[PDB]
């Protein structure tokens, strides 16, 4: 009646589509972006960590963030109307209400886009591989921004939206979990560099086996969008690659599926890796190495250097990185290379 009217007004063709997914996607995405943009502009983090992170306080674009809540909030969501600000907007901004605001509204914007991709694919009449492929960034998002702080004691250890605050996350993860020495991260890095490797090489091969159909040196003008005749010699690409490297694709369908497969799996394996850290289960040691370095003090490996360096990262970043513990270390118990 009115339902099929609401249907065909939404599912209609326009300069940019909306659909049923539009109803969830657009408010959530727009609020999350808008929140980050006002947070980086006016909002302090001086009542939480003792930082300044906004243009109003005098910070540049490389040092701003919408910073996390305080440690004493636990895992509270900090709702505007709730009994931690009691209907008050100023305190709600100071206590970090914008971080959770942005995080939840962005979490629903991701589901909106995911659904939007499904809907447009069902409409156009193609297979939905692009929506299955898009579950890797949502896996990463909910493993790093949601599951990891929910395994810890607060939102305080989650990464803050900002570039330098993510850099501090990199150093924190390296320092306290030795994150590069965990095999799931090895697999994620490999998967991602292999995605990057396939990108350059596939482009370079297709663009350097093109047929003559133009008049000018540029061959960008020899293309019509129809698929009636082939646009690059696949046979030649195979013959080339089987001879310079040893193995080659001889199946386009499989080549493009390999391109889908490598980085999405990489990110999935890394998502399993960071949920493993949320319980503080962390690959940090090989027991055989400790017992050996215990019985022989003139044994050295690069791994032992890395653990001494991890000591340096932790002991020197802990004071201003965990102010809620009110840590005070004397200057004589800080670790030093020259004291060894």
């Amino acid at each position: 009646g009115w339902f099929d009217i609401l249907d065909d007004w939404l599912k209609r063709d326009r300069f940019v589509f909306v659909g049923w997914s539009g109803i969830l996607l657009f408010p959530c995405a727009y609020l999350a972006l808008g929140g980050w943009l006002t947070g980086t502009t006016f909002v302090t983090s001086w009542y939480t960590h003792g930082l300044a992170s906004s243009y109003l306080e005098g910070c540049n674009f490389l040092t701003v963030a919408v910073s996390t809540p305080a440690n004493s909030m636990g895992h509270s969501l900090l709702l505007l109307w709730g009994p931690e600000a009691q209907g008050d907007f100023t305190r709600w901004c100071q206590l970090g209400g914008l971080w959770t605001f942005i995080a939840l509204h962005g979490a629903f914007g991701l589901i909106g886009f995911m659904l939007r991709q499904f809907e447009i694919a069902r409409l156009v009449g193609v297979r939905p591989y692009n929506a299955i492929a898009f579950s890797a960034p949502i896996a990463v998002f909910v493993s790093v921004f949601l599951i990891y702080p929910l395994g810890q004691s607060s939102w305080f250890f989650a990464p803050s939206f900002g570039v330098a605050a993510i850099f501090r996350f990199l150093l924190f993860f390296q320092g306290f979990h030795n994150w590069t020495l965990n095999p799931f991260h090895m697999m994620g890095v490999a998967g991602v560099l292999g995605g990057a490797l396939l990108c350059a090489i596939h482009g370079a091969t297709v663009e350097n086996t093109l047929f003559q159909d133009g008049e000018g040196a540029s061959t960008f003008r020899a293309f019509n969008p129809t698929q009636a005749e082939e646009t690059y010699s696949m046979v030649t690409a195979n013959r080339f690659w089987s001879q310079i490297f040893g193995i080659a694709f001889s199946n386009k369908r499989w080549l493009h599926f390999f391109m889908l497969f490598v980085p999405v799996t990489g990110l999935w394996m890394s998502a399993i890796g960071v949920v493993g850290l949320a319980l503080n289960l962390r690959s940090y040691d090989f027991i055989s190495q400790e017992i050996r370095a215990a019985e022989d003090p003139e044994f050295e490996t690069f791994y032992t250097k890395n653990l001494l360096l991890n000591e340096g990262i932790r002991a020197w970043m802990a004071p201003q990185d965990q102010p809620h513990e009110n840590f005070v270390f004397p200057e004589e118990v800080l670790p030093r290379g020259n004291a060894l």
Binding site: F118, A121, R122, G125, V126, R127, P128, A131, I132, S135, A139, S143, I147, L150, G151, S153, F176, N182, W268, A271, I272, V275, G276, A278, L279, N280, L281, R282, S283, Y284, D285, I287, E290, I291, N310, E311, R314, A315, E325, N326, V328, F329, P330, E332, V333, L334, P335, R336, A339
Partner: protein, 485 residues
Amino acid sequence: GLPWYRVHTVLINDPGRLIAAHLMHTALVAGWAGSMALYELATFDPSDPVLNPMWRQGMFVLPFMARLGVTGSWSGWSITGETGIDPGFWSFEGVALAHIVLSGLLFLAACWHWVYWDLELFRDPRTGEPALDLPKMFGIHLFLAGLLCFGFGAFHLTGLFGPGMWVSDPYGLTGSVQPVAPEWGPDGFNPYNPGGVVAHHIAAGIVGIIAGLFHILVRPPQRLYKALRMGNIETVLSSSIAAVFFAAFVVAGTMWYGSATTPIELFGPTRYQWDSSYFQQEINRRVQASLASGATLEEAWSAIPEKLAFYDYIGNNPAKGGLFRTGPMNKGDGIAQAWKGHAVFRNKEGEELFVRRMPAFFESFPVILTDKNGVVKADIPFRRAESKYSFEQQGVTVSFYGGELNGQTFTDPPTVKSYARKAIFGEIFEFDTETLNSDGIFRTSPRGWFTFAHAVFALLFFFGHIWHGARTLFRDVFSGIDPEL
């Protein structure tokens, strides 16, 4: 033909064989359960429950049947700690062998159903090819579940025929199985209230009967039938999987933050109790209450339970340990024997010092002695000829109150350092590392393994969900598209 990742697709259109496969799978899950129980009963030490409980020995399936009230062993020892019992048939072994017999029954039927797959029952009485009437089945199965859920909550948890369930006190010193009683109050929604769990299985029980009846009586609207691709079995798969990782994420969370149904006596303390100093506060409450009523320090601190001090130790914190450190918690730092007692460090002046205790985050933390204000008075310095606050220059002594070192003092610097560098771990115990060849590096808790695994599986079952949802909604547009030519 079929590739290796679609080989189990000869059961999509054939019901008889599908039942057989499901039955055979259930027989494996049940056989594994029985066999795991037997395996853990071969590696449990029951003599010491105060300093060698189940959750320190890396027992995974043993607490789950102790949660509902099995406590007996035919050996005549219980996990509560009483000896010279008899439970009748139902011991740990009883359940353990019962699962073996059930596995066998299910395997025999699975063979039958694989062989006699063709029945008139699966054929349509109109078209004569295999169909299942899925809404009817949902109705019957919701009826079956609601009836059994109502039965479990009504007869088992109340102990009105059954045992009851395991309840404890806030500090997990005394824990038992008792009949519990329902609560329909608002407090029935507090997870730290047993009564609410009883009330649930009754209320949600009858709600399950009504809906189970409803779905058998009415027939689905045309609109939903066409919408969620009904009559295609593969959407039942997709919906059911969405429900599974809902449930998984909940049991990972309720286990990790703890609840009244994962007491701190069948899974050990949580980390949210170490960082909030849950047990240190009860210990202080008792000892100040003891000193105010009059007592000396020696008397007062020896009055503390061995259990309540044993929880106040970072080796029971499941946030310590690692991903590739294997075996029991005992394999990490030895089987506890006895308590050395509370350590009190003092300066030559006459002031009492306090050692800052280690956080969960670190893998080595500097040793610092502060006084009341919070300012450092002593430390063990990392630097090796530059010191101001070292124990030798300050004259630090250590005294013990309570336990086997009671009334003792140590005044030579190495022993004072030895006790202080392990005082950052909390209370001091004596451990035995020569009977499981422990190497002194922590191992994580069964609580922690549980929440790690179920989180991982939930994160994968989300992928499972969105893939099987796509297969049922793009069934007729797979195998490539008509290129409209």
